[PDB]
Design a protein around this ligand. Structure first.
Ligand SMILES: CC(C)(COP(=O)(O)OP(=O)(O)OC[C@H]1O[C@@H](n2cnc3c(N)ncnc32)[C@H](O)[C@@H]1OP(=O)(O)O)[C@@H](O)C(=O)NCCC(=O)NCCS
Length: 268
């Protein structure tokens, strides 16, 4: 029997979600189980749980991000530069690998989208515009990014059946951590500025591992190692959301732990 919207709202309430909260969900729909009206039932429940003054922030990225196609180049290769679609924030589908719920969040009426094609964030609520902008190339997840403002607004991270590797906010911790040998990457993104496609090439911290030892693809990254150590040492509200075991995490607390975690193991 599929989970109803009212059943999920009660579960979110038991977990500690309050009206007015700013919540960032990481969802495994298969862990949740069948819903009354598909994934939209959970989206409606998330919006009701945070209330009209609350906010939802999701890391949705872009299904057709030219990340690997322009990685390590001072400019987009010619074939990529001539034909790749410009990132149209209100029309670009989310990256499926980060959760099928993100395409439902992203198309919700009133949802705003950041202009960073690879690190794109979707936001719903009164603070949606303030969260999504600015989001410039070179500030994917560190200061001046939606995550930074999310951390300055008592944000809560809502893992719904997702693994510890899915804590996007911890990319802020590795962006500001004062450690040696932080990996950087160079890539190009096609922005849509006043209807005109503009190619922008930038450098930023590697979001696939801030250090060499954390960047192997086989392969727990720094986010997963930090999150597991945090969840092993911290009392965190846990409970069911649908059929998925869920956690409500204080975003500023796990990021502070992440900074201390990185700086304790690597010199400055
Ligand atoms: C990796 C991960 C996404 C895999 O979890 P998953 O449950 O297997 O995959 P999803 O949550 O995206 O959803 C899968 C289900 O939704 C279905 N689905 C996809 N689009 C759908 C649609 N429009 N309508 C209905 N169902 C849809 C899929 O077909 C699948 O259903 P199925 O079992 O019948 O085949 C999850 O574990 C996770 O980590 N999510 C957080 C990811 C994240 O935020 N990463 C950030 C890193 S910085």
């Amino acid at each position: 029997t599929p989970w109803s919207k009212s059943e999920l709202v009660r579960q979110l309430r038991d977990l500690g979600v309050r009206s007015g909260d700013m919540v960032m969900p990481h969802v495994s729909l298969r862990a949740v189980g069948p819903l009354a009206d598909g994934p939209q039932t959970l989206v409606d429940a998330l919006i009701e749980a945070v209330g009209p003054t609350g906010n939802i922030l999701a890391f949705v990225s872009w299904r057709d991000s030219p990340y690997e196609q322009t990685l390590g180049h001072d400019a987009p290769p010619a074939a990529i530069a001539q034909s790749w679609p410009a990132f149209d924030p209100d029309h670009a589908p989310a990256y499926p690998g980060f959760g099928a719920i993100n395409e439902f969040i992203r198309t919700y009426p009133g949802c705003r989208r950041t202009a960073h094609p690879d690190a794109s964030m979707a936001a719903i609520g009164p603070d949606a515009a303030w969260l999504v902008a600015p989001h410039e190339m070179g500030a994917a997840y560190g200061p001046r990014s939606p995550i930074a403002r999310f951390l300055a607004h008592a944000g809560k991270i809502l893992s719904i059946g997702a693994g510890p590797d899915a804590v996007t906010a911890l990319h802020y911790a590795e962006a500001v951590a004062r450690i040696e040998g932080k990996r950087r990457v160079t890539y190009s993104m096609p922005l849509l500025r006043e209807g005109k496609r503009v190619w922008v090439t930038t450098s930023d911290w590697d979001s696939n591992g801030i250090l060499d030892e954390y960047a192997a693809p086989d392969g727990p990254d720094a986010v997963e190692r930090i999150a597991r150590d945090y969840l092993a040492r911290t009392r965190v509200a846990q409970g069911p959301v649908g059929g998925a075991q869920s956690r409500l995490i204080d975003a500023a607390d796990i990021v502070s732990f992440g900074i201390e975690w990185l700086e304790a193991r690597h010199a400055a």
